[PDB]
Design a binder for this molecule. Structure first.
Ligand SMILES: COCC(=O)Nc1ccc(O)cc1
Ligand SMILES: [Zn+2]
Ligand SMILES: [Zn+2]
Ligand SMILES: [Zn+2]
Length: 459
């Protein structure tokens, strides 16, 4: 059972207000036919327009909430809402666009999905809370058929042009008018009691209902994200590389080793409490320190309460030494900490919008992270940039412009002039640091941290 069967039953109760007298007994096959699409028995890689929850989770980057609200059904004009915040009005003659015919509306839809998804995914998945109009309106902007490749590249086709009779991916679809072979999933098929707002509002206060179609489209995708990534967590699903994932993860490993090595040299803590990943290894394996591990998985709902991680009866004394919280999101960190906390507000192709202020960070695996809260770090300060190194000054083996910096903490810089080796290593580390910061990670440290205490290790 790879794909969803077209002979699977579809509960049509949520459709009977827009579609009165709809058969209670309904399959995907009959629904697709009712929507105006002919599948003609096609074993060409597109078995069903509707997909399973497991396939939807594998393609979370393609999710676009979609909702259609009648303003007045081929007689009345429809308001099309997308989780991008766009509202288009179609006439059959929170960005609100005036009533325009379908032939020009469909052009805007391909432009919008292409610009939203070209750097995210090879497809679109319309996430629905289906009442009728969104499915019946799909025939005015969707064309289906066999799986195809782009006319200008090797990616799968996601768009079609009537003007040129050709197919394109999101990167080459300029001027295309049809959405080609889209995917869709109805959240209402998952078994919920009550309307969209009542289910969404149970888990989210950040999205409201200004009573437009895009509001519902946003609430739909947020409810889907809550169900598939907040309450249900599967860390065994891998995701393709769509950006700087390899560089960001290597930058995070270098920064961690650096920052923890220097805190241990500067303040010589006798014990380090490493709270987080149950699979974590010592990031500074040569340190003298008593390294103690505490397991806590990444929290996806709310950030951990420090009282429930530390108390209820390890050294038991977390107040001795330093606490390391590398991506272990808590409500309020203790004052003796080193913290890497992902900032959910960051705008990037890896960070997708989430539930209740949180975000879905997709790098190798999907991690719904709770909302970034500035008050979590009141007992700490922002960790300032510095590069520290005790390694010998020796070139071995790119050209050179002499490096002058107050934050290159090395024997050569103490001695008055940074050597070539430490200058290459400084600029490589600064690049990894800027990568890590721009990916959304924020660094914080105990208030007594001072890089001035690092020069004394050059005696
Ligand atoms: C389908 O998954 C393919 C893959 O290898 N993905 C991957 C993503 C990020 C990363 O940092 C390393 C690997
Ligand atoms: Zn292409
Ligand atoms: Zn929400
Ligand atoms: Zn040097």
């Amino acid at each position: 059972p790879t794909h969803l069967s077209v002979d699977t039953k579809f509960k049509t109760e949520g459709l009977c207000v827009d579609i009165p007298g709809i058969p209670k007994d309904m399959t995907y096959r009959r629904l697709i036919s009712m929507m105006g699409f002919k599948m003609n028995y096609q074993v060409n890689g597109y078995p069903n327009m509707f997909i399973t929850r497991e396939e939807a989770i594998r393609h979370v980057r393609a999710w676009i909430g979609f909702d259609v609200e009648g303003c007045h059904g081929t007689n009345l004009p429809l308001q099309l809402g997308f989780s991008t915040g766009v509202n288009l009005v179609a006439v059959p003659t929170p960005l609100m666009y005036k009533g325009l015919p379908w032939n020009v509306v469909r052009i805007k839809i391909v432009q919008m999905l292409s610009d939203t998804l070209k750097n995210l995914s090879d497809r679109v998945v319309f996430v629905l809370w289906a009442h009728g109009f969104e499915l019946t309106s799909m025939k005015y902007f969707v064309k289906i058929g066999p799986e195809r490749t782009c006319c200008l590249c090797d990616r799968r086709a996601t768009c079609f042009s009537t003007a040129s009779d050709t197919y394109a991916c999101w990167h080459h679809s300029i001027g295309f008018d049809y959405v080609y072979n889209p995917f869709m999933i109805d959240v209402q098929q998952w078994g919920f009691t009550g309307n969209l707002q009542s289910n969404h509002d149970l888990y989210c206060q950040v999205h409201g209902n200004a009573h437009v179609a895009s509001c519902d489209a946003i609430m739909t995708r947020c409810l889907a994200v809550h169900e598939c990534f907040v309450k249900r967590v599967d860390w065994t699903i891998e995701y393709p590389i769509i950006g700087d994932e390899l560089k960001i993860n290597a930058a995070c490993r270098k920064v961690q080793h650096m920052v923890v090595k220097a805190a241990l040299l500067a303040d010589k803590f006798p014990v380090l409490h490493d709270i987080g990943n149950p699979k974590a290894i010592k990031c500074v394996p040569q340190a003298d320190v008593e390294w103690k591990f505490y397991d806590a998985q990444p929290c996806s709902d709310k950030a951990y309460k420090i009282e429930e991680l530390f108390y209820s009866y390890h050294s038991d004394k977390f107040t001795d030494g330093v606490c390391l919280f590398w991506n272990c999101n808590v409500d309020r960190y203790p004052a003796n900490s080193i913290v890497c906390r992902f900032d959910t507000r960051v705008l990037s192709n890896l960070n997708l919008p989430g539930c209740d202020g949180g975000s879905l960070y997709v790098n190798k695996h999907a991690f719904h992270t709770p909302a970034f809260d500035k008050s979590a770090f009141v007992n700490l300060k922002q960790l300032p940039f510095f590069y520290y190194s005790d390694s010998p000054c020796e070139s071995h083996g790119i050209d050179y412009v002499p490096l002058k910096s107050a934050t290159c903490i090395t024997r050569c810089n103490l001695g008055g002039a940074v050597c070539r080796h430490h200058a290459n290593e400084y600029r490589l580390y600064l690049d990894a640091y800027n990568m890590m910061i721009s990916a959304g990670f924020s660094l914080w440290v105990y208030k007594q941290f001072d890089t001035y205490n690092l020069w004394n290790t050059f005696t």
